[PDB]
Amino acid sequence: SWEVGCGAPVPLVKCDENSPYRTITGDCNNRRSPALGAANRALARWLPAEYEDGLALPFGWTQRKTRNGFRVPLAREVSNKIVGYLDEDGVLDQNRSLLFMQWGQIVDHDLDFAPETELGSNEHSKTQCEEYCIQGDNCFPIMFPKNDPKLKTQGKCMPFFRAGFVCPTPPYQSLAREQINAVTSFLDASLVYGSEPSLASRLQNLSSPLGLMAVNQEAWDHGLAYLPFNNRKPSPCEFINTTARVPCFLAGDFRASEQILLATAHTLLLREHNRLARELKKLNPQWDGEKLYQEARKILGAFVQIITFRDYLPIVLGSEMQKWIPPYQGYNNSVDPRISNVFTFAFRFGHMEVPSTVSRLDENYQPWGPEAELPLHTLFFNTWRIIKDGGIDPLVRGLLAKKSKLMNQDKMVTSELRNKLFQPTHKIHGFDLAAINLQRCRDHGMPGYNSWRGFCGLSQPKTLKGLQTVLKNKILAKKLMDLYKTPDNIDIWIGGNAEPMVERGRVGPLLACLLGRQFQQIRDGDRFWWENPGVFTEKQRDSLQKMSFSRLICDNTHITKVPLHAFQANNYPHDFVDCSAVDKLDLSPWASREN
Ligand code: HEM
Ligand SMILES: *[C@@H]1O[C@H](CO)[C@@H](O[C@@H]2O[C@H](CO)[C@@H](O[C@@H]3O[C@H](CO)[C@@H](O)[C@H](O)[C@@H]3O)[C@H](O)[C@H]2NC(C)=O)[C@H](O)[C@H]1NC(C)=O
Ligand SMILES: *[C@@H]1O[C@H](CO)[C@@H](O[C@@H]2O[C@H](CO)[C@@H](O[C@H]3O[C@H](CO)[C@@H](O)[C@H](O)[C@@H]3O)[C@H](O)[C@H]2NC(C)=O)[C@H](O)[C@H]1NC(C)=O
Ligand SMILES: *[C@@H]1O[C@H](CO)[C@@H](O[C@@H]2O[C@H](CO)[C@@H](O)[C@H](O)[C@H]2NC(C)=O)[C@H](O)[C@H]1NC(C)=O
Ligand SMILES: *[C@@H]1O[C@H](CO)[C@@H](O[C@@H]2O[C@H](CO)[C@@H](O)[C@H](O)[C@H]2NC(C)=O)[C@H](O)[C@H]1NC(C)=O
Ligand SMILES: [Ca+2]
């Protein structure tokens, strides 16, 4: 049996072969099958999907349906018993800057987004779901287990809506349900430019032929650009402080305002596009408005890639880097560049790297003002602290000089995210990202832990003693067993994250494998990979190889002191040097010598 057909919600457009620029949607990257790695299509299944009813119901939907003969435990109950911790002392990655957490979220955002199903704005699937906690259709509420303190203050559940799926977004009934990636699978700064035409243009400055992205005309940062604000009302950035009335930003990606440091990095990207475009017109004064946009956008895309594969992945994998991402050997069109459904959970290792507070630091890197450090939760959907506090600048210094959270088998996810998450259609700082992630694993039909162990050539523990051995942790294993009753039922997010953290890396073996494999394909199956012969000239590639996040900071802020290796843990002033000492990006090689 088999089904190749289904790809109905897609406008299938021309591929201008030889074009030297990526499309916005990601179509036409791969020539044999030009929908490969395009946005708005069904994420890839490395392993057949696993639902309660074979088709679409997330294990845990039916109380009289076991998984392998055992009920699956409530997501919130796994959160409470395994994921949570009280004492934030001692949980600071000694050798990773806070930038390390933040880049990961940036890369994640470039690569995947599975939007909640939306059949109703003015429809009571939302209200009935939130108010009365009745599971049905796309309402899959996260129920509190006996003894939960949120029972006392928040109700019977936290709302949760099932992710969008292809074919139709009303129910289906032939193939297994397949969730959508709404963004492009190819690491191509789609978070900045958008993955759809409608937005990419709306993002553009089509008032002038300079190839610039649209900037805030309401607020400014020492004459440095801010991102435009967004249309949407209701606005959750507004709802955060209804007095200040500062809305969310508008970026290539809709999540850019989830937290202030994400919105900051987005700032650390729009700026550079425009810097790059201005420098480019200055040099090639005959170039189109379009041409300037595309060639900046190309260089930016190349920056995301280089920072990611040269600086980030080596330190997020460790020992396994070489085992899954051998040095580049060219473009391979037989490679599938699609983001897999499991990767979208594996990449959520980042959630254990988020610490409980964010600092603003002045130019001696000392607290900035009387409220320099804030609880992370007061910063979900918070632009106003950017616009009417300090710059971006103090936050970027914090990104450099403060540390990531270290994942810890006994202190997984800070309560800032585990109890205080703010959703943008629900009025409280009262949600649990960990619960949500577990529920979503089930929503998405994920195979369990041991299925992924087996996929990656690793042992598949069956017996509580065997699980202790894999996780080198008696007590964690015990709680996992007590709750799941068989490692085969352990949800991939929590299983993958429970494994000790490799060597020199920040993920376990199961994750290294899932992540390495996805990034290898991201790298090998992209026709516009920066390092693919043809995409850039050898000259051009000699200039791009010197880019650095440091350099990005220098050219787009008024920070004049940065470390050389920004992802590592760095302290001021010892690990910092002046922007003078820090390599520039030399665009001589972009000179259009059509003569
Ligand atoms: C708030 C949130 C963060 C920080 C303050 C945060 C951080 C990260 C990092 C650092 C990631 C990678 C290193 C990462 C990956 C992914 N996240 Fe996550 N994250 C915050 C909040 C959320 C929320 C909310 C979601 C949606 C949850 C849902 O299932 O309903 C979320 C998701 C993800 C995600 C899946 C994205 C997708 O493909 O749709 C990651 C890969 N994060 N986060
Ligand atoms: C903190 O983690 C850093 C990385 O953030 C650790 O050091 C990294 O380890 C690599 C080895 O793979 C080193 O890179 C090597 O350096 C030589 C030149 O001496 C160069 O030819 C290559 O680039 C080579 O890979 C390097 O020390 C470092 N890498 C980077 C990018 O910083 C470090 O061990 C940890 N720091 C502390 C204080 O423990
Ligand atoms: C909602 O946003 C408000 C800003 O839009 C914020 O209030 C701001 O923060 C403090 C509160 O006093 C003020 O900072 C200083 O203001 C002047 C300095 O010129 C001093 O008189 C004060 O003592 C103070 O140090 C901001 O000026 C202030 N602005 C306003 C209009 O109050 C709120 O705190 C935000 N509220 C929430 C719940 O997030
Ligand atoms: C689109 O670009 C035009 C041309 O630069 C912008 O107009 C400039 O705006 C800046 C402030 O943003 C001021 O110097 C002048 O108003 C214009 N400068 C020049 C040299 O003409 C316009 O702001 C941009 N529009 C948007 C919405 O970003
Ligand atoms: C591109 O990648 C694919 C991986 O799927 C390679 O194709 C496989 O190559 C191995 C060894 O030659 C064979 O055993 C497989 O059966 C091949 N499968 C297919 C579909 O071709 C391919 O060799 C790689 N190409 C390059 C140039 O590296
Ligand atoms: Ca992308």
The secondary structure of 60-83, three-state, reads CCCCCCCECCECCCCHHHHHHHHH
- Tell how strand 142-143 and strand 157-158 pair up: antiparallel
Give me the helices (H) in 460-535, please: 464-470, 474-484, 492-498, 509-524
Bridge partners of 155?
none
Ligand number nearest CA of 106 is 1
List, by residue number, the catalytic residues: 109
d(CA 296, CA 236): 31
Residue type, 24: I
Q: Is 315 in the pocket of ligand 2 (CB under 6 A)?
A: yes
Q: Pick from 79, 258, 419 the residue to mutate for probing ligand 1's pocket: most ligand atoms within 8 Å of its CB.
A: 258
Resolution in A: 2.1
**Token couple for 11:** 């406008």
8 A C-beta contact, residue 277 and residue 290: no
**CA 73, 76, 80: angle at the middle one, nearest 5?**
100
C-beta 219 within 6 A of ligand 3: no
The verdict on the CB of residue 332 being under 6 Å from ligand 5 is yes
Go through 243-260 and write b for each residue having 16 or more CB atoms within 10 A of its CB, e for each that does not: eeebbbbbbbbbbbbbbb
Q: Which two tokens stand for residue 196?
A: 């759809």
φ, ψ at 550 (rounded to 5°) = -45, -55
Which atom of ligand 2 is nearest the CA belonging to 310?
Answer: 31
| CA of residue 389 to ligand 4 center, whole Å | 25
CA of 570 to the centre of ligand 2 (A): 13
State the closest ligand 3 atom to the C-alpha of 243, by its place in the atom list counted from 1: 1
Instruction: Let me know: does 13 contact 34? Beta carbons within 8 Å.
Output: no
Q: Ligand 2: distance of its center to the CA of 264 in Å? A: 27
In the chain, the amino acid numbered 518 is: Q
Ligand 4 close to Cβ of residue 207 (< 6 A): yes
List the residue whose alpha carbon is closest to atom 26 of ligand 5. Answer: 332
567 lines ligand 2 (CB under 6 A): yes
Nearest ligand 2 atom to alpha carbon 95: 1
Q: CB 214: neighbour CB atoms within 10 A?
A: 18
Asked if 424 and 126 count as a contact pair (C-beta separation under 8 A), the reply is no
Ligand 4 centroid, distance to 248 Cα (angstroms): 21
Query: Is there a cis peptide before residue 234, judged by omega within 30 degrees of 0?
Result: yes
Q: How far does the centroid of ligand 5 lie from the alpha carbon of residue 4, in Å?
A: 22
- For residue 215 and ligand 4, the question of a CB distance below 6 A is answered with yes
For residue 207, the ligand 4 atom closest to its alpha carbon is: 1
What distance in Å separates the CA atoms of residue 507 and residue 498, rounded to the nearest whole number?
9
d(Cα 575, Cα 401) in Å, to the nearest integer? 9
- Asked if 433 and 421 touch (Cβ cutoff 8 Å), the reply is yes
Cis before 247 (ω within 30): no
Q: Which CATH architecture has domain 1-595?
A: Orthogonal Bundle (1.10)
Q: At CA 230, angle to CA 228 and CA 232, rounded to 5?
A: 170
Residue 321: helix, strand or coil by DSSP?
A: helix
**Ligand 5: distance of its center to the CA of 335 in Å?**
8
Mutate to test the pocket of ligand 5, among 33, 329, 332, 529 (most ligand atoms within 8 A of CB): 332
Q: Are 413 and 355 in contact (CB under 8 A)?
A: no
Is the distance from the beta carbon of residue 245 to the nearest atom of ligand 3 less than 6 Å?
Answer: no
DSSP code string of 73-118: PPHHHHIIIII--S--TT---TT-BHHHHHHHHHHHHHH----B--
Which one, of 196, 206, 191, 207, lies nearest residue 268 by Cα?
191
> 497 alpha carbon to ligand 4 midpoint, in Å?
47
Locus of tokens 């998450």: 421
| For the chain, domain boundaries | 1-595
Which among 212, 220, 281 is the best mutation to test ligand 4's pocket, defined by most ligand atoms within 8 Å of the CB?
A: 212
Distance 105 CA to ligand 1 centre (A): 7
Chain centre distance of CA 439: 18
Which CA distances in Å does 297 have to 109, 203, 502, 545? 17, 13, 35, 17
Q: Provide the phi-psi class of 472: left if phi over 0, else alpha when psi is between -120 and 50, else beta.
A: left
- With b for 16 or more beta-carbon neighbours within 10 A and e for fewer, the 109-121 pattern comes to bbbbbbbebeeee
State if residue 105 touches ligand 1 by the CB under 6 angstroms criterion. yes
Compute CA 41 distance to the chain's CA centroid, rounded to the nearest angstrom.
Answer: 18
- From 202, 203, 204, 207, mutation site for ligand 4 pocket: most ligand atoms within 8 A of C-beta: 207
From the CA of 493, the nearest ligand is: 1
User: By alpha-carbon position, which residue is closest to atom 19 of ligand 5?
Assistant: 334
Give the whole-angstrom CA distance, residue 382 versus residue 374: 12
Integer Cα distance of 241 and 36 in angstroms:
42
**Among the bound ligands, the one closest to the CA of 520:** 5
Residues with Cβ < 8 Å from 310, sequence gap 6 or more?
A: none
Atom 15 of ligand 4, residue of closest alpha carbon:
217
Report d(CA 44, CA 579) in Å as an integer: 43
Q: Helices in 115-224 by DSSP H: which ranges? A: 127-132, 149-153, 190-193, 197-202
Ligand nearest to the CA of 437: 1
